[PDB]
Design a protein around this ligand. Structure first.
Ligand code: 72W
Ligand code: CL
Ligand code: CL
Ligand code: MG
Length: 213
């Protein structure tokens, strides 16, 4: 099997069904003690919690679910009736994420879309009944952050005030995206310095709030 499957099974073996904190803690312990994995992690995760609580979004889009760590983190903090859409191209990872959300008891808050973001984004309005997004969490391949930010705009999915929150803007880094939003009158940017998951290495999140066209 794969590292991702081993993470899920360690959650199953250890955590408590219906308890999202137990799931987060299980994943973090596995990935600290056994095998590193690219989950956002607890350090950055605490910043994400603070941002999600500040804005109280009704509709969040995540790009790159992976094993569902960040989807559990965000969905647990959504107000009742608010929703998360998460896109994941890898079918195996998409199924791991769904099972992780199911185990956490958060399945009714989250829709896992198995496909490439560039294919799914244009479908959001007609197929998933989206008007505009309140928040977008970027955590997929780093060279797709800028392409997909521009595609979101083109598709009319950003409103005045939509909060973009980008992982890994220091390591591995997303240089075209970061330079773009920081240089653009269409974004208001704030940097939250933190640490790479499971490591004593500086990373950070970028918050980039869309100002309108
Ligand atoms: C095609 C568009 C598209 N559409 C839909 N789903 C997509 C997608 N592109 C990618 N996916 C999925 O997203 C996830 C990949 C995410 C990529 N993430 C990092 O590379 C990364 C690396 C480090 C790090 C590595 C090594 C180091 F030394 C240090 C840091 C730390 C981090 O937090 C990181 O996020 C997987 O589930 C993909 O299947
Ligand atoms: Cl994650
Ligand atoms: Cl961490
Ligand atoms: Mg990341």
């Amino acid at each position: 099997d794969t590292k991702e499957q081993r993470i899920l099974r360690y959650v199953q073996q250890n955590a408590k069904p219906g308890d999202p904190q137990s799931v987060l803690e299980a994943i973090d312990t596995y990935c600290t003690q056994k095998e590193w994995a690219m989950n956002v992690g607890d350090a950055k995760g605490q910043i994400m919690d603070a941002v999600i609580r500040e804005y109280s979004p009704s509709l969040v889009l995540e790009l790159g679910a992976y094993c569902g760590y960040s989807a559990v983190r965000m969905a647990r903090l959504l107000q009742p009736g608010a929703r998360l859409l998460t896109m994941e191209m890898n079918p195996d990872y998409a199924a791991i994420t769904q099972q992780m959300l199911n185990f956490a008891g958060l399945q009714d808050k989250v829709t896992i879309l198995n496909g490439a973001s560039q294919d799914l984004i244009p479908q959001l309005k007609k197929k998933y009944d989206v008007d505009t997004l309140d928040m977008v969490f970027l955590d997929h391949w780093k060279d797709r952050y800028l392409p997909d930010t521009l595609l979101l705009e083109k598709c009319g999915l950003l409103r005045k005030g939509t909060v973009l929150l980008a992982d890994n803007v220091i390591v591995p880094g997303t240089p075209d995206f970061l330079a773009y939003v920081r240089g653009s009158s269409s974004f208001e940017c704030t940097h939250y310095s933190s640490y790479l998951e499971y490591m004593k290495v500086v990373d950070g999140l970028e918050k980039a709030i869309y100002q309108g066209p």
